[PDB]
Amino acid sequence: FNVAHGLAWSYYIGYLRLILPELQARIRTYNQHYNNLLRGAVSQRLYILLPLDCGVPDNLSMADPNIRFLDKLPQQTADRAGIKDRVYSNSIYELLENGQRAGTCVLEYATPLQTLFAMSQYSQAGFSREDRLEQAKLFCRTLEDILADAPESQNNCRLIAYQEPADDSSFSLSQEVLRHLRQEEKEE
Amino acid sequence: FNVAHGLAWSYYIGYLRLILPELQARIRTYNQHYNNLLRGAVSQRLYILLPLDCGVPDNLSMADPNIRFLDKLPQQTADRAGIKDRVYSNSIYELLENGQRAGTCVLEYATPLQTLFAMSQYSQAGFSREDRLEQAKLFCRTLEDILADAPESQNNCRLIAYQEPADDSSFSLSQEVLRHLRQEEKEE
Numbered sequence: 001f002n003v004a005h006g007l008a009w010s011y012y013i014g015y016l017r018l019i020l021p022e023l024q025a026r027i028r029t030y031n032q033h034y035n036n037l038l039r040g041a042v043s044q045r046l047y048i049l050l051p052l053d054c055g056v057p058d059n060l061s062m063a064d065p066n067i068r069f070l071d072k073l074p075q076q077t078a079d080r081a082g083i084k085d086r087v088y089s090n091s092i093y094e095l096l097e098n099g100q101r102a103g104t105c106v107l108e109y110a111t112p113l114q115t116l117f118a119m120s121q122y123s124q125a126g127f128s129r130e131d132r133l134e135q136a137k138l139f140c141r142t143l144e145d146i147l148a149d150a151p152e153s154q155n156n157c158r159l160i161a162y163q164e165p166a167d168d169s170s171f172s173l174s175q176e177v178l179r180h181l182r183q184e185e186k187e188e
Numbered sequence: 189f190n191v192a193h194g195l196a197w198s199y200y201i202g203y204l205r206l207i208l209p210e211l212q213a214r215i216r217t218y219n220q221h222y223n224n225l226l227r228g229a230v231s232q233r234l235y236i237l238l239p240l241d242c243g244v245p246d247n248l249s250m251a252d253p254n255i256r257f258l259d260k261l262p263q264q265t266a267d268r269a270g271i272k273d274r275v276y277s278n279s280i281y282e283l284l285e286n287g288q289r290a291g292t293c294v295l296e297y298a299t300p301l302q303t304l305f306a307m308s309q310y311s312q313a314g315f316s317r318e319d320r321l322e323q324a325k326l327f328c329r330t331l332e333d334i335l336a337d338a339p340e341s342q343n344n345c346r347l348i349a350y351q352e353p354a355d356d357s358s359f360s361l362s363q364e365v366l367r368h369l370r371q372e373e374k375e376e
């Protein structure tokens with residue numbers, strides 16, 4: 001089956017569509033209340049790590065020690081049937097560079113990529129572990145094309161797609177994330 | 189595209205697989221702390237409303253006035269990358285019969301059916317509004333076949349699939365839900 005397509009659409013409809021519009025105000029609140037001082041500096045976008053290899057560790061610090069958990073973005077509450085006042089969780093990380101706090105932003109993996117990885121295990125899934133990669137590529141794809149026409153995506157988030165070279169492991173996830181942050185500084 | 193399949197699998201992998209094992213203990217706690225007084229009576233299963241017509245209202249009371257929100261099942265917390273301590277929300281409803289509290293259980297719609305309904309709107313979704321029904325049927329389907337081999341589903345939840353007659357509107361959702369409760373009471 002072609003799943004990447006459906007998961008991208010479920011992802012947007014049940015999450016991005018809902019949270020992105022109310023996202024920036026939530027960021028602003030954290031900044032005002034927590035400091036309105038010192039670093040503040042929480043970036044204004046939702047950052048979605050897109051590991052093409054579909055490897056998604058539950059603790060972000062594990063993938064890279066330089067990615068440190070700061071706080072949790074103030075809850076969002078919504079009556080998502082049948083649930084009442086259903087909580088939506090985002091986590092705030094600060095990226096370290098040579099022991100220096102280089103940036104602070106709302107950051108997270110794309111769960112759909114993780115589910116994709118898990119699905120290949122199951123017999124009835126039924127898409128081979130081989131198809132994990134193309135499925136991964138189709139996902140980031142569909143999202144871009146979805147977010148392109150997203151009235152909500154008034155540049156509220158930035159996708160971060162990456163694959164780590166097979167031969168060498170000199171890849172720094174924090175570095176990848178920092179690039180986008182800095183670039184958007186020159187951009188913004 | 190065939191989406192019902194992927195959404196059923198995402199649903200189980202990212203939700204049911206995770207919460208069902210820890211579900212009953214959460215139920216016991218509400219019963220124990222809140223009581224052990226008066227009704228208690230929270231049922232021991234997760235109830236998933238499966239409207240084949242794919243109509244999923246955000247407020248459960250609206251669908252049926254006799255379905256009343258009681259409280260919220262104690263939070264579950266899990267490090268769901270990239271999120272840390274990601275909250276999982278379930279709501280407890282008590283069903284009314286002729287002004288009488290007939291039952292109390294954890295109850296909710298299947299969000300995937302709601303997303304299915306929303307997808308048909310979009311141009312790129314790729315699937316006609318016509319296909320909403322077969323997509324709905326394939327979803328409840330896949331879930332049953334998924335939950336059948338679910339090591340986790342040690343009878344922790346019961347699916348409730350239903351479609352409302354086209355000619356007449358004498359259908360009581362609370363009645364449908366009560367049936368399953370009583371019938372399982374026969375399980376005792």
Ligand SMILES: Nc1nc2c(ncn2[C@@H]2O[C@@H]3COP(=O)(O)O[C@H]4[C@@H](O)[C@H](n5cnc6c(=O)[nH]c(N)nc65)O[C@@H]4COP(=O)(O)O[C@H]3[C@H]2O)c(=O)[nH]1
Nearest residue numbers: 011014015083087088089111199202203271275276277299
């Ligand atoms: N950081 C973050 N990301 C979020 C949140 N909610 C949704 N997402 C993203 O939205 C995807 C699909 O959301 P879904 O439509 O709600 O559909 C969900 C929903 O139907 C069910 N589900 C998941 N979590 C909960 C929950 O906490 N409570 C209830 N009642 N159902 C849930 O699992 C389906 C798929 O779950 P997912 O695999 O998790 O995948 C979720 C997840 O990738 C959130 O609160 N925080």
Ligand SMILES: [Mg+2]
Nearest residue numbers: 014015080299
């Ligand atoms: Mg949702």
Ligand SMILES: [Mg+2]
Nearest residue numbers: 111202203268
């Ligand atoms: Mg999940």
